[model samples]
Target chain A: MKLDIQCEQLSDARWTELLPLIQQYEVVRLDDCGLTEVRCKDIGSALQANASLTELSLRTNELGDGGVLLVLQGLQSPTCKIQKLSLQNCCLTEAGCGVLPGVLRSLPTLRELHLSDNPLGDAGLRLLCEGLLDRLEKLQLEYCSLTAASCEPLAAVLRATRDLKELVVSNNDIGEAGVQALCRGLAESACQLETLKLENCGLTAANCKDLCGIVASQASLKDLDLGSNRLGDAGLAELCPGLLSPSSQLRTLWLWECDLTVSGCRELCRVLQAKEALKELSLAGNSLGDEGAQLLCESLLQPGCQLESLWVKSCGFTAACCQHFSSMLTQNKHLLELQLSSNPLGDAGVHVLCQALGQPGTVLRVLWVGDCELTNSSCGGLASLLLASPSLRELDLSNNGLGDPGVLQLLGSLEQPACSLEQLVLYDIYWTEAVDERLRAVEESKPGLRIIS
Target chain B: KETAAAKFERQHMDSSTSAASSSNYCNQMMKSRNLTKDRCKPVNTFVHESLADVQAVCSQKNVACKNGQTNCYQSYSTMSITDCRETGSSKYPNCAYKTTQANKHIIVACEGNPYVPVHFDASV
Candidate 1:
């Protein structure tokens, strides 16, 4: 009558006592127990006759391709209920992957398959696509040695799949040609792919041309990460225009440390200022500088811009740049979050920001002012801003010396009910025992407020 | 290892994926992030929005959690996020990811200290 069985470092002989209920069990986990070829047949017999095993994870086992084939025989039965399968870090290879199609075809109930850390090359990937194209919704083949040649079959699978929503094939050299072929299939196929990640596939500006075309035509894609590709400013410029198309319903785009410049920022600012679909934009590790900040602020001012969050770190900004940034803080009321870390926002810039936060005009909810060259002088202004801003819930003051006086001063306002601060991050900020005790007491007094150090 | 809360912020919070422009992004991050430490993480998501925006989802429309909890929240506006998946044949040192962008309403679990994202439930 029992339905779930779990064993650790167990042998097939142990199952002899439970053989009567083998088919009755629905869930089984035999992970990291030193399963091997000889024992596979013993487990394979359990799988073959097992009635309704729905979820199985055989991670960290030495199940070679032959061993997997033995287990697949059980899964091949019409009565098999195995739906989710994970064989991570197993001794699988091209030969193991070569036989997956039969198991996939037999188990029409299968939905999720994970075979990460296996050295199944292009042959393994292409062969599996031959028969399992329409049966799976989630497929993970990470660490598979897939190449440009694998794209055609993968694209064909994408074109034919019914509900394939997520596909992850990271750590390969698919290159521009591979991605281009996939884009072509995505454009022409009926695949409803919502998430596709191709990180470190040798992407470049040359690839962006194909991606831009796909962006204009594909509407289902919502998340795309081209980080660490060093796509550069030129690559960005090439892709921005297509993203602006109304047909492209992209919501999130990530491009970290892609060697962007002021010019690329201009092109991006132009498109971002015009669209309402994209709600989040991350542009880190680039020195967009004062001019780039101003360029972005100009677009933020546009009524069409729907920017809710912006991160400008290490952008070589200073107090002088606060003028337009101050404008963005005050006039662009739609922006609910801003992170200006690593910029020299000093007292001069923080003071200017205080002028905006002091007003009840902005609905800004979270602000990060880390490493902004702030001193205790900026604290008084920030304290008043905290009091004036009722919507401000979270603040970060790490890497700045508010001195003991500055923090206590802010704590004084926080003691009152006017400040709506919930969680305050003080990472990299110095704290003494006495001050910490006081902060803890202050935290005790106000249950709604947190003083994180 | 940082607190579970800190991990959530660092891994999921980003108001802009467009800001991260690096070659070998997934390759470096999967390892740097400790996702590929012992073994490769098959599928993961990084939000490309401000931390507040992701947190604000707690106040958005209520939805049934994937785990069947009633405490889940879905974002009103479509969010920007990156999907990082390891390749089929990738190994530990060479853990790679396919980086793709999309606009989606995020589903997250909110708990404690004003209810920020404690877990990434899914993306719809």
Candidate 2:
């Protein structure tokens, strides 16, 4: 038995010789070993006869709160069977939330708990809402300085836990009354929360009427993130009557820099024509210009519109509402995904969105008009709507300044072939390396093409 | 005349008897074989005789292990020879030998206008 290990710092004499070789190992990564305090009587007398440690990562060590209460007393021993525990930026505090609800009521096969950038306030998030009321499914408290007094003890432990689905408390401050008291524990109905993130908290408009009554009484809420809050226009007119209630089950709504205007784009185009269950709306960096994009082009000419993703980055349109948003995209269908980035909408709003991307009930596939102050007469109506969009597939004219003959008139619409354009983000475009080797030889004879610059 | 550790212990006991007869020769790998055919014949003959005694004591070591050079001279399987340095480069013209005591290896590099060579060797 010859072992002469020399760890310059895991201290406590190298976790008392690596806790009995981490119970014969099963996964233990001591990242950046320069650990800081970690008491619990040096990990309950060295992992009381440790049991094949199930996965532990002490990232960027300095594990405060006595090194996460000495790794929660070896994960509340009982031959600890940790199922994934990563303590990133290990300086946890708030008295390490009294050792996490008695180690999540004795870790019942923990599923995944990453305590990100710990500062764990509000009484360490009311002791992590008492181990998220138990049976955690996935919890990553990012930048943990959670606020609103950690939302009524995390909405009374997510209304007495029903097996959490996914909760990422992003860069915490949890304002907007801690996201309307965590959407009143996801407007219970035995909430099984799908995905919720409250980025750059400090939300306002007095918690948009409890986030429009938890998206009109959550029906298993999908994915909601109120990005960089300040939620104005009376929090989008209190989330436009709960997004034009039809018992809205919200698909995805990440309103960045929420100081939205243009009467919150006419109350989000009257809840996109009286709700149809919003498919995805990211109103990025709100400024909602050009009469709030012609009142969201008359709610994309409602026809039971369930808006298929629309992100208005740096919203502030112009070029005279490109023929009223190209006649409401040639009399709307059901938009697929459109991100009008950093607007100025020049070249007559890319020639009225290239005459509604050359008609055919334009279901507009994925088009991000980057830095929308486009030039070269707006790359000839975005190269004739990339050769008359047959449902354009992903196109982000990144940081538009077009140049190089507006990318040689959009590489002549990627030399069409009924071009169902497959991903072409020209970040900082200027072209010419023989037109990027003729658009990488027509994207190597098509087959699901890609042209990311 | 067979020696490189008895031909790596008969090619590690013929690839563990052809991986237990190609895991019951497919059918979605015999529906995830739940053993019990007499426990898959003594656990596939005790993993082909403990991997033919660990490939006859790992091919009778003789030096060359320097990649991630494991301690005492060099000869590790489950790794631990100071996992051959280089966690911040430059220690001996990229020595060798770290078979895996952890922190597998990865070297991906491609920064600035055409310079690619993404290395990968994960086992974490």
Candidate 3:
């Protein structure tokens, strides 16, 4: 938990001052501050007796094979207790991974390792995975230019570990075939990944179906992200059944910009109402218009639905669907956070939701309404919701035309006896300096209230 | 002059800094990073490392942020940084700084999605 590192570029004169602290800390990071092969050896030697040291992050330091070999030499000591190490965006290659097997295999505590943005292609990853594959719980490998070629090595690694929980392999071209191969590994008994982020991997319906099979085959997965891909309705629809399957354990699903439509949402809504464990869902940047939202709201209104957080940013929602959303927010006892930023929830929409938000019985605690085409006119409704709902602690009113007077109107409710707002974000609300001063004065008067304008 | 890129550089970067940089690194960098403008910042840190190293801190040790956010992490390793402490005698237009370097750890608070850093809690 404790992280300590020596400055890289300091003169050798200060090395004595900095080197001594290395033994005393459990976490060490010597990023691009100036790590050389010689310095790596220095660190390695110091770390041999370092029973207390556990994590090391050497990001963006060109710790080539030579430097990595020297450092791995130090970590080879039985007394070394390093658990998590990040060498992200470093100039590491097969040279470093070649030497990782011996040291990584023997370390029982090495559970988290980050090799993202490195050139550890299939061969390198296979080499690194040969030993520590079964022990790692979290592994991030984003932007490594990996292709379907890296599947089985990853598959082999996944097949060997039952504790792997979080795996982020985004920003690559792990298309349908590669994803299918990877999913085959996920179906293995040893695989227990919970959070899987595969954004921008050029995934498709085939990949989505495979991912569904992967999750459906396992009961440990809780989070799945398939954003920024071409996972159109076909992709999402293919995944929906697995989400609703008897063994499914997914809790949070993020599908940002997957080209979803009302059809895709309909498939997801079936799972939404059935999956009792699902608590958080994000469908941002998808034009799941009022029709799509209206369909999604149907499930949120169901007593069987237990989702606690929902983000529908830029879902093409207008005031037309506000009444439905407001009803969902007011009626759904489990949802505590509702984020609808970047939508057109202007005065008309805010007006509809204010009725529900103004209810003291409302369970909503966080509401993000920034950049929602709101005007100062909407502040009246917002002010009412602020005063009435004690549970509503955070309210974001940024990126709106809620002029100085609008904010002033909202401030009027803060003075009310029942006002329980803790944080009020009001950036870019077109407030004048005078209005800001007035708002500041109001904030100062409110004792514990925070007003960010 | 403050674009998102500039703010990002100011908030989470200072890569070219020398390991041999002095305590005055902060004064020079705080302005270079455009943190000191109409007035000098009360306190600010310049992390002399690659931005990726900093971004990865979000996935490091987890802790509650100063803002009560649960998405904060305290870097397990010490960062190469210089802190700009506003001088007591400095006025608004003539803001001044007393730069200091320390082998201290940093508490980085950030959230998901491109996992951006929001604040520098403290370095000690």
Candidate 4:
């Protein structure tokens, strides 16, 4: 069994009551519960008592090195069977890293360790790299205050750790020098990473050649995220060869805010139309205007295109591009999820999309149109579409001007037998209590419905 | 609309229950009380005191609520209560809870001229 709880202000009395039950859960997550060093001793005792717990995540707590040491003391138990431990943003530092190596060496069942956002600097990472890291299959060190000085030790670990399939080192200014050193290790090593995320690492066009080499050479490499980098059209074009290669089995690609435009979308569509293995693509935060969206929609309409999810948030889209999306939805049966949040698609655009959504042969399950300047005028069409479409499970209409009248139009159809929407996100809508009551009534009628106000 | 006093009675009052109830008390009481009908109440406390005695907590020591309201009051004496917290495996219709019994001073929020308990705020 799993026990996952987060963002609750747990009192000491509640913790004392729940400590015994912690031993019964195999996967436990107590993130963002206002935990400190004082609770670590109890957590240590619970860990020492339980041998079935294989996964534990205690993210966003203020558990510093003093707290982590107590937990490590429990992890030293010979009966400990922890396979995954995530302590992201727990205020850890060099002192915590100094103790992690010994505990990691002692724990024979550990394979996945996530210590992201802990300010573990170069020295701390060097100490961690000296442990038995070769047995680890997954390691995440995002926002760990690392630099180029930390790359040699990390590269050594990558060279030695052959089973490591995933590595996330985003949000650090690991410059081109650091990536170059890491690339040398990847080139000579026997490691085969499946997922690699290096977002906001101050990469440029100069690093694309090495990245392209890794992408083309590693057969198991599938998911790659290089978002928030200055890898402009030239850098993107350089990686196109590897992306188009037969050895490239990339299933998901995230290139958000990479200084891309319509020109980059034109090149990316080539890979989308050709690579049948590519399923998910995120191009959010880029200025992919109406023409760029049109190009992507046209690519999805091509033969052998198996793309399912597309995220184009904040891509400067308007109502002019909605017609292309409407056409793509009716024709393409592969795309299931489409995110159009933070765009300028007003009620008229939503009206056009709703018309296409009501048609048959469209398997769209999720559609997010948050902050798109919608009003009650679009609710009539949306209500009708809800009654017509049974595949749309999640609909996000957050940060809109949908008032009481707008929700009332949708309320009647929401109670209809045809409507199967599971989640309706309506955040930032300051409606009246009558609207809230009607929504609550609709939720009471449908036990599966969840309306996030 | 149900009155606030009536809602409080539906949520908190369990005067007829024994002090040492079974572990299934929360699962059955929470459902029969309609707290798990529409959605699961994350946490609730059922006081094993008389209705008038529980209402008298509103006239006792005045205190500030967690929501920064000063209309809350705490009881003078400790009372038998059962804390019901929804388990992680709980779904919408099948809401499961872990029950823990305690004897503590109950805090309640009060309003209006009659000044009865309208909201069970917390326990100390």
**TM-score of each model, paired residue for residue:** 0.66, 0.29, 0.75, 0.76
Least lDDT summed over 10 consecutive residues: which range in candidate 1 chain A?
A1-10
Interface DockQ per candidate: 0.02, 0.02, 0.03, 0.03
lDDT on C-alpha atoms for all candidate structures: 0.73, 0.61, 0.74, 0.83
Model 1 compared with the native: what TM-score?
A: 0.66
The model with the greater DockQ, 1 or 2, is: 1
Top model number, lDDT: 4
Q: Where's the lowest-lDDT run of ten residues in candidate 3 chain A?
A: A427-436
Interface RMSD, model 1, angstroms: 16.9
Q: Which residues of candidate 2, in runs, are more than 4 Å off? A: A1-99, A102-156, A160-195, A198-213, A216-241, A245-270, A273-280, A283-296, A300-351, A354-367, A370-425, A428-453, B1-124
lDDT string for model 4 (A1-453, tens) is 888876676987899987986765789898778889999999988988888889989887889999888877887888888999998778889878888778888887988989887889998889888884457888899879999988899888888877889988877888889988887778777888999988878888778888889888888998898888888888888888889889998998989888988987898889998999999888888999999999998999999689999988889999999999999998888898998988999999998899999997788998989778887888898888888885788888866767667888888888987788988876444454446667778888998888753
Candidate 2 structure, TM-score to reference:
0.29
- Residue A185 lDDT (model 3): 81
| Model 2: per-residue Cα lDDT at residue A393 | 78
Q: Compared with the true structure, what per-residue lDDT tens digits does model 2 show for residues A176-289?
A: 667777877767636566777776678788888877877677666787777777878877787778767776767777776778788877867777776676787777778877
Comparing to the true complex, what docking class would candidate 1 get? incorrect
After TM-score superposition, the amount by which residue A418's alpha carbon in candidate 4 deviates from its true location, in angstroms, is 2.5
Model 1 stretches astray by more than 4 angstroms: A1-96, A112-124, A140-145, A373-378, A398-415, A428-430, A442-453, B1-124
What are the RMSDs of all candidates, in order? 14.5, 20.7, 13.2, 12.1
